[PDB]
Amino acid sequence: TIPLVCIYMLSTNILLVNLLVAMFGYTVGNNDQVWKFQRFFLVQEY
Amino acid sequence: TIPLVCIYMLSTNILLVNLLVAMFGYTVGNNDQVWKFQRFFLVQEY
Ligand SMILES: CCCCCCCCCCC
Ligand SMILES: CCCCCCCCCCC
Ligand code: NA
Ligand code: NA
Ligand code: NA
Ligand code: NA
């Protein structure tokens, strides 16, 4: 258990960070034109 | 239990806040140049 909680302290903080990257990764990387192209894109196929 | 839930009302709100600081602390403190230095940094060692 000297490394087994350090498994869970390393399992969390690589799945937790990947979860938090998923919540926030839309922010990094004109956003009315970036939207209005995609709103035009999706409605055009239907 | 007059203080024991106030333990848990103080345990949460110091671990919850430290969790929420972890989600949001990347925002505070040029971010194309701040990235492109680190993308150059990591690829250069490999
Ligand atoms: C093995 C458990 C280590 C602590 C888990 C706390 C993670 C909280 C995640 C809430 C999104
Ligand atoms: C002792 C429990 C006190 C309430 C816990 C609610 C915290 C929700 C955290 C969700 C990230
Ligand atoms: Na886990
Ligand atoms: Na997790
Ligand atoms: Na707690
Ligand atoms: Na918590």
PDB file of C-alpha atoms and ligand atoms in Angstrom:
ATOM      1  CA  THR A   1       0.000   0.000   0.000  1.00  0.00           C
ATOM      2  CA  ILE A   2       3.099   2.235   0.078  1.00  0.00           C
ATOM      3  CA  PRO A   3       2.730   2.293  -3.726  1.00  0.00           C
ATOM      4  CA  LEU A   4      -0.929   1.162  -4.039  1.00  0.00           C
ATOM      5  CA  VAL A   5      -2.427   4.470  -2.976  1.00  0.00           C
ATOM      6  CA  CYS A   6       0.254   6.084  -5.144  1.00  0.00           C
ATOM      7  CA  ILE A   7      -1.291   4.061  -7.950  1.00  0.00           C
ATOM      8  CA  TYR A   8      -4.602   5.739  -7.154  1.00  0.00           C
ATOM      9  CA  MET A   9      -2.851   9.066  -6.629  1.00  0.00           C
ATOM     10  CA  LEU A  10      -1.458   8.572 -10.144  1.00  0.00           C
ATOM     11  CA  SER A  11      -4.556   6.969 -11.687  1.00  0.00           C
ATOM     12  CA  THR A  12      -6.537   9.940 -10.563  1.00  0.00           C
ATOM     13  CA  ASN A  13      -4.478  12.975 -11.808  1.00  0.00           C
ATOM     14  CA  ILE A  14      -4.207  11.321 -15.203  1.00  0.00           C
ATOM     15  CA  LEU A  15      -7.897  10.499 -15.634  1.00  0.00           C
ATOM     16  CA  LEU A  16      -9.009  13.524 -13.627  1.00  0.00           C
ATOM     17  CA  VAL A  17      -6.833  15.816 -15.739  1.00  0.00           C
ATOM     18  CA  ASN A  18      -8.081  14.197 -18.950  1.00  0.00           C
ATOM     19  CA  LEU A  19     -11.600  14.802 -17.664  1.00  0.00           C
ATOM     20  CA  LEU A  20     -10.816  18.435 -16.890  1.00  0.00           C
ATOM     21  CA  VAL A  21      -9.123  18.867 -20.271  1.00  0.00           C
ATOM     22  CA  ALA A  22     -12.416  17.686 -21.789  1.00  0.00           C
ATOM     23  CA  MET A  23     -14.395  20.347 -19.912  1.00  0.00           C
ATOM     24  CA  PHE A  24     -12.053  23.186 -20.826  1.00  0.00           C
ATOM     25  CA  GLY A  25     -10.336  22.221 -24.092  1.00  0.00           C
ATOM     26  CA  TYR A  26     -13.004  23.912 -26.194  1.00  0.00           C
ATOM     27  CA  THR A  27     -11.856  27.324 -24.924  1.00  0.00           C
ATOM     28  CA  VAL A  28      -8.306  27.354 -26.298  1.00  0.00           C
ATOM     29  CA  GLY A  29      -8.068  27.213 -30.087  1.00  0.00           C
ATOM     30  CA  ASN A  30     -13.947  35.209 -34.633  1.00  0.00           C
ATOM     31  CA  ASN A  31     -16.220  32.831 -32.717  1.00  0.00           C
ATOM     32  CA  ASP A  32     -19.371  34.204 -34.321  1.00  0.00           C
ATOM     33  CA  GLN A  33     -17.927  33.300 -37.722  1.00  0.00           C
ATOM     34  CA  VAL A  34     -16.640  29.984 -36.353  1.00  0.00           C
ATOM     35  CA  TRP A  35     -20.164  29.221 -35.170  1.00  0.00           C
ATOM     36  CA  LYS A  36     -22.123  30.559 -38.170  1.00  0.00           C
ATOM     37  CA  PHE A  37     -20.125  28.364 -40.528  1.00  0.00           C
ATOM     38  CA  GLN A  38     -21.041  25.267 -38.501  1.00  0.00           C
ATOM     39  CA  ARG A  39     -24.686  26.263 -38.056  1.00  0.00           C
ATOM     40  CA  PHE A  40     -24.777  26.699 -41.816  1.00  0.00           C
ATOM     41  CA  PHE A  41     -22.922  23.418 -42.253  1.00  0.00           C
ATOM     42  CA  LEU A  42     -25.265  21.175 -40.245  1.00  0.00           C
ATOM     43  CA  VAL A  43     -28.548  22.683 -41.466  1.00  0.00           C
ATOM     44  CA  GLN A  44     -27.366  22.361 -45.083  1.00  0.00           C
ATOM     45  CA  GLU A  45     -27.053  18.560 -44.928  1.00  0.00           C
ATOM     46  CA  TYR A  46     -30.588  18.108 -43.606  1.00  0.00           C
TER      47      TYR A  46
ATOM     48  CA  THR B   1     -22.369  16.046  15.802  1.00  0.00           C
ATOM     49  CA  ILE B   2     -22.838  19.768  16.531  1.00  0.00           C
ATOM     50  CA  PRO B   3     -19.227  20.107  15.324  1.00  0.00           C
ATOM     51  CA  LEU B   4     -18.871  16.795  13.407  1.00  0.00           C
ATOM     52  CA  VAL B   5     -20.893  17.892  10.403  1.00  0.00           C
ATOM     53  CA  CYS B   6     -19.066  21.216  10.713  1.00  0.00           C
ATOM     54  CA  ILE B   7     -15.929  19.134  10.293  1.00  0.00           C
ATOM     55  CA  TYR B   8     -17.378  17.861   7.022  1.00  0.00           C
ATOM     56  CA  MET B   9     -18.664  21.331   6.178  1.00  0.00           C
ATOM     57  CA  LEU B  10     -15.060  22.481   6.654  1.00  0.00           C
ATOM     58  CA  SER B  11     -13.356  19.416   5.156  1.00  0.00           C
ATOM     59  CA  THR B  12     -15.378  19.929   2.048  1.00  0.00           C
ATOM     60  CA  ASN B  13     -14.866  23.671   1.194  1.00  0.00           C
ATOM     61  CA  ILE B  14     -11.139  23.208   1.674  1.00  0.00           C
ATOM     62  CA  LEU B  15     -10.756  20.107  -0.498  1.00  0.00           C
ATOM     63  CA  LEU B  16     -13.581  21.138  -2.816  1.00  0.00           C
ATOM     64  CA  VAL B  17     -12.026  24.573  -3.301  1.00  0.00           C
ATOM     65  CA  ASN B  18      -8.590  23.039  -3.875  1.00  0.00           C
ATOM     66  CA  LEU B  19     -10.231  20.800  -6.463  1.00  0.00           C
ATOM     67  CA  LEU B  20     -11.907  23.769  -8.136  1.00  0.00           C
ATOM     68  CA  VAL B  21      -8.661  25.755  -8.030  1.00  0.00           C
ATOM     69  CA  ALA B  22      -7.111  22.841  -9.942  1.00  0.00           C
ATOM     70  CA  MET B  23      -9.772  23.030 -12.663  1.00  0.00           C
ATOM     71  CA  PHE B  24      -9.503  26.786 -13.107  1.00  0.00           C
ATOM     72  CA  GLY B  25      -5.988  27.800 -12.029  1.00  0.00           C
ATOM     73  CA  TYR B  26      -4.614  27.411 -15.545  1.00  0.00           C
ATOM     74  CA  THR B  27      -6.680  30.408 -16.694  1.00  0.00           C
ATOM     75  CA  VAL B  28      -5.126  33.124 -14.526  1.00  0.00           C
ATOM     76  CA  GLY B  29      -1.434  33.749 -15.168  1.00  0.00           C
ATOM     77  CA  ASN B  30       0.354  35.856 -25.730  1.00  0.00           C
ATOM     78  CA  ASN B  31      -0.997  32.322 -25.304  1.00  0.00           C
ATOM     79  CA  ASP B  32      -0.046  31.301 -28.831  1.00  0.00           C
ATOM     80  CA  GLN B  33       3.564  32.185 -28.019  1.00  0.00           C
ATOM     81  CA  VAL B  34       3.239  30.578 -24.579  1.00  0.00           C
ATOM     82  CA  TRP B  35       2.068  27.397 -26.286  1.00  0.00           C
ATOM     83  CA  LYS B  36       4.449  27.394 -29.278  1.00  0.00           C
ATOM     84  CA  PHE B  37       7.447  27.615 -26.968  1.00  0.00           C
ATOM     85  CA  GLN B  38       6.279  24.517 -25.077  1.00  0.00           C
ATOM     86  CA  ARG B  39       5.330  22.585 -28.214  1.00  0.00           C
ATOM     87  CA  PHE B  40       8.815  23.376 -29.465  1.00  0.00           C
ATOM     88  CA  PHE B  41      10.253  22.457 -26.077  1.00  0.00           C
ATOM     89  CA  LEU B  42       8.773  18.956 -25.768  1.00  0.00           C
ATOM     90  CA  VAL B  43       9.310  17.880 -29.387  1.00  0.00           C
ATOM     91  CA  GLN B  44      12.950  19.015 -29.198  1.00  0.00           C
ATOM     92  CA  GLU B  45      13.856  16.565 -26.415  1.00  0.00           C
ATOM     93  CA  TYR B  46      12.467  13.573 -28.305  1.00  0.00           C
TER      94      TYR B  46
HETATM   95  C1  LIG C   1      -8.618   6.954  -4.746  1.00  0.00           C
HETATM   96  C2  LIG C   1      -9.431   8.222  -4.496  1.00  0.00           C
HETATM   97  C3  LIG C   1      -8.520   9.444  -4.582  1.00  0.00           C
HETATM   98  C4  LIG C   1      -9.326  10.718  -4.322  1.00  0.00           C
HETATM   99  C5  LIG C   1     -10.443  10.852  -5.353  1.00  0.00           C
HETATM  100  C6  LIG C   1     -10.977  12.282  -5.365  1.00  0.00           C
HETATM  101  C7  LIG C   1     -11.251  12.680  -6.812  1.00  0.00           C
HETATM  102  C8  LIG C   1     -12.481  13.577  -6.898  1.00  0.00           C
HETATM  103  C9  LIG C   1     -12.873  13.725  -8.366  1.00  0.00           C
HETATM  104  C10 LIG C   1     -14.103  14.620  -8.491  1.00  0.00           C
HETATM  105  C11 LIG C   1     -14.339  14.959  -9.961  1.00  0.00           C
HETATM  106  C1  LIG C   2     -20.312  15.702   3.835  1.00  0.00           C
HETATM  107  C2  LIG C   2     -20.947  15.975   2.475  1.00  0.00           C
HETATM  108  C3  LIG C   2     -21.135  17.478   2.285  1.00  0.00           C
HETATM  109  C4  LIG C   2     -21.781  17.759   0.929  1.00  0.00           C
HETATM  110  C5  LIG C   2     -20.900  17.219  -0.194  1.00  0.00           C
HETATM  111  C6  LIG C   2     -21.310  17.840  -1.528  1.00  0.00           C
HETATM  112  C7  LIG C   2     -20.045  18.137  -2.328  1.00  0.00           C
HETATM  113  C8  LIG C   2     -20.285  17.909  -3.816  1.00  0.00           C
HETATM  114  C9  LIG C   2     -18.940  17.952  -4.537  1.00  0.00           C
HETATM  115  C10 LIG C   2     -19.142  17.729  -6.033  1.00  0.00           C
HETATM  116  C11 LIG C   2     -17.837  18.016  -6.772  1.00  0.00           C
HETATM  117 NA    NA C   3      -9.467   6.029 -10.131  1.00  0.00          NA
HETATM  118 NA    NA C   4     -11.690  10.262 -12.120  1.00  0.00          NA
HETATM  119 NA    NA C   5     -14.933  15.083   2.673  1.00  0.00          NA
HETATM  120 NA    NA C   6     -14.327  16.762  -2.189  1.00  0.00          NA
END
